[PDB]
Swiss-Prot record:
Origin organism lineage: Eukaryota, Metazoa, Chordata, Craniata, Vertebrata
Subunit-structure text: Monomer.
Reported disease: A chromosomal aberration involving CHCHD7 is found in salivary gland pleiomorphic adenomas, the most common benign epithelial tumors of the salivary gland. Translocation t(6;8)(p21.3-22;q13) with PLAG1.
Subcellular location: Mitochondrion intermembrane space
Main location: mitochondrion
Listed GO CC annotations: mitochondrial intermembrane space; mitochondrion
Family to which this protein belongs: Belongs to the CHCHD7 family.
Residue span relative to the full protein: 14 to 85 of 85
Chain ranges for the short sequence motif Cx9C motif 2 as given in the UniProt record: 24-34
Disulfide bridge map: 3-34, 13-24
The organism of origin for this protein: Homo sapiens (Human)
GO biological-process terms attached to the record: mitochondrial respiratory chain complex assembly
UniProt keyword annotations, A-Z: Chromosomal rearrangement, Disulfide bond, Mitochondrion
Protein's UniProt name: Coiled-coil-helix-coiled-coil-helix domain-containing protein 7
Domain CHCH: 1-42
Motif (Cx9C motif 1): 3-13
């Protein structure tokens, strides 16, 4: 599952500067951290095997509240 916050801001960076995808590598790193976090939540829901595992908007909200910071 993608991280559209780091997707838009990395595209804005790369557009500003020479398509310098390696000098904005930190955004793609925070995107892989975001992928790993939400894949962790998917696996922590999949232990019961019964709901849609990819968290819905109010789950993403209450879970971000329960981290108390950005997982990115």
């Amino acid at each position: 599952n993608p991280c559209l916050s780091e997707s838009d801001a990395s595209t804005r960076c790369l557009d500003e500067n020479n398509y310098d995808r390696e000098r904005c590598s930190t955004y793609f790193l925070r995107y892989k951290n975001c992928r790993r976090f939400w894949n962790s939540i998917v696996m922590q829901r999949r232990k019961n095997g019964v709901k849609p595992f990819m968290p819905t908007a109010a789950e993403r909200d209450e879970i971000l509240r329960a981290v108390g910071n950005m997982p990115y």
